[PDB]
Design an enzyme around this catalytic site. Structure first.
Site, short mmCIF file in Angstrom:
data_model
loop_
_atom_site.label_atom_id
_atom_site.label_comp_id
_atom_site.label_asym_id
_atom_site.label_seq_id
_atom_site.Cartn_x
_atom_site.Cartn_y
_atom_site.Cartn_z
N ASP A 89 41.89 43.72 57.69
CA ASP A 89 41.70 44.95 58.54
C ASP A 89 41.44 44.62 60.04
O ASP A 89 41.02 45.49 60.87
CB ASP A 89 40.60 45.88 57.95
N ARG A 134 40.43 46.35 65.05
CA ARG A 134 39.89 46.64 63.75
C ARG A 134 40.52 47.96 63.37
O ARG A 134 40.47 48.93 64.14
CB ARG A 134 38.37 46.72 63.85
N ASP A 155 38.32 49.76 54.86
CA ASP A 155 37.61 48.50 54.72
C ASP A 155 38.34 47.64 53.70
O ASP A 155 38.46 48.03 52.55
CB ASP A 155 36.19 48.78 54.29
N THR A 156 38.83 46.48 54.13
CA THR A 156 39.38 45.48 53.24
C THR A 156 38.27 44.55 52.79
O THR A 156 37.28 44.41 53.48
CB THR A 156 40.53 44.71 53.89
N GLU A 169 36.34 41.04 52.55
CA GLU A 169 36.34 39.82 53.34
C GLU A 169 37.23 38.79 52.58
O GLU A 169 37.41 38.89 51.37
CB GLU A 169 34.91 39.27 53.58
N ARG A 225 35.84 44.98 69.63
CA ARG A 225 37.13 45.16 68.95
C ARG A 225 37.69 46.51 69.30
O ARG A 225 36.92 47.50 69.46
CB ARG A 225 37.01 45.05 67.40
C1 LIG Z 1 35.93 50.62 61.36
C2 LIG Z 1 34.78 50.63 62.28
C3 LIG Z 1 33.79 49.68 62.21
N1 LIG Z 1 32.77 49.67 63.02
C4 LIG Z 1 31.65 48.74 62.92
C5 LIG Z 1 30.64 49.32 61.88
C6 LIG Z 1 30.14 48.06 61.18
O1 LIG Z 1 28.98 47.50 61.84
P1 LIG Z 1 27.99 46.41 61.16
O2 LIG Z 1 28.68 45.08 61.46
O3 LIG Z 1 26.90 46.64 62.09
O4 LIG Z 1 27.91 46.53 59.69
C7 LIG Z 1 31.27 47.07 61.35
C8 LIG Z 1 32.14 46.84 60.10
O5 LIG Z 1 33.27 46.05 60.41
P2 LIG Z 1 33.83 44.98 59.39
O6 LIG Z 1 34.15 45.75 58.12
O7 LIG Z 1 35.01 44.44 60.14
O8 LIG Z 1 32.74 44.02 59.26
O9 LIG Z 1 32.05 47.52 62.35
C9 LIG Z 1 32.63 50.73 63.95
O10 LIG Z 1 31.59 50.73 64.73
N2 LIG Z 1 33.57 51.66 64.07
C10 LIG Z 1 34.63 51.72 63.25
O11 LIG Z 1 35.47 52.62 63.33
CA LIG Z 2 36.15 44.23 56.14
#
Ligand SMILES: Cc1cn([C@H]2C[C@H](OP(=O)(O)O)[C@@H](COP(=O)(O)O)O2)c(=O)[nH]c1=O
Ligand SMILES: [Ca+2]
Length: 129
Positions: A15, A29, A34-35, A37, A75
């Site tokens: 993702d 991103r 959510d994919t 890890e 991102r």
């Molecule tokens: C998809 C997405 C993720 N994120 C943030 C929330 C999550 O924060 P936390 O890291 O604080 O858990 C994190 C999840 O991304 P990943 O799934 O790439 O880790 O990215 C956003 O802020 N906005 C979004 O639209």
């Molecule tokens: Ca992920």
């Protein structure tokens, strides 16, 4: 919403993708999914799926939604299209991502993705097996 050009720099995982956007490198991103890890069950298969899609396409595009365009980690936040196919929908339809991170200003394609997830769930695909 509208699609904008970008060029693949490199696929990262299920993702996240590094793209050149308006001439600058940035990690994107995918919105609304959510994919797993890479170290989790179905992560390698998610990473492989997204990699093929964005590498094989003649034309990758980004589509920002109406709200935030970058996350707290710097991102980019967008829908990604590979030869006009939304990477989110493809992943979700295959059971390789869940609909997730559905935040209020940036949820234009939620219901499309939910519909795809319901069909994946029905077919018991991958994450739903
Ligand atoms: C998809 C997405 C993720 N994120 C943030 C929330 C999550 O924060 P936390 O890291 O604080 O858990 C994190 C999840 O991304 P990943 O799934 O790439 O880790 O990215 C956003 O802020 N906005 C979004 O639209
Ligand atoms: Ca992920």
């Amino acid at each position: 919403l509208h699609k904008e050009p970008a060029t693949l720099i490199k696929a990262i995982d299920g993702d996240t993708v590094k793209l050149m956007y308006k001439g600058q490198p940035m990690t994107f991103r995918l919105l609304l999914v959510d994919t797993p890890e890479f170290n989790e069950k179905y992560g390698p298969e998610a990473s492989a799926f997204t990699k093929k899609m964005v590498e094989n396409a003649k034309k990758d595009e980004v589509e920002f939604d109406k709200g935030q365009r970058t996350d707290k980690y710097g991102r980019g936040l967008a829908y990604i299209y590979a030869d006009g196919k939304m990477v989110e929908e493809a992943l979700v339809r295959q059971g390789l991502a869940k609909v997730a991170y559905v935040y209020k200003g940036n949820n234009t394609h939620e219901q499309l993705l939910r519909k795809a997830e319901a069909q994946a769930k029905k077919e018991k695909l991958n994450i739903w097996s």
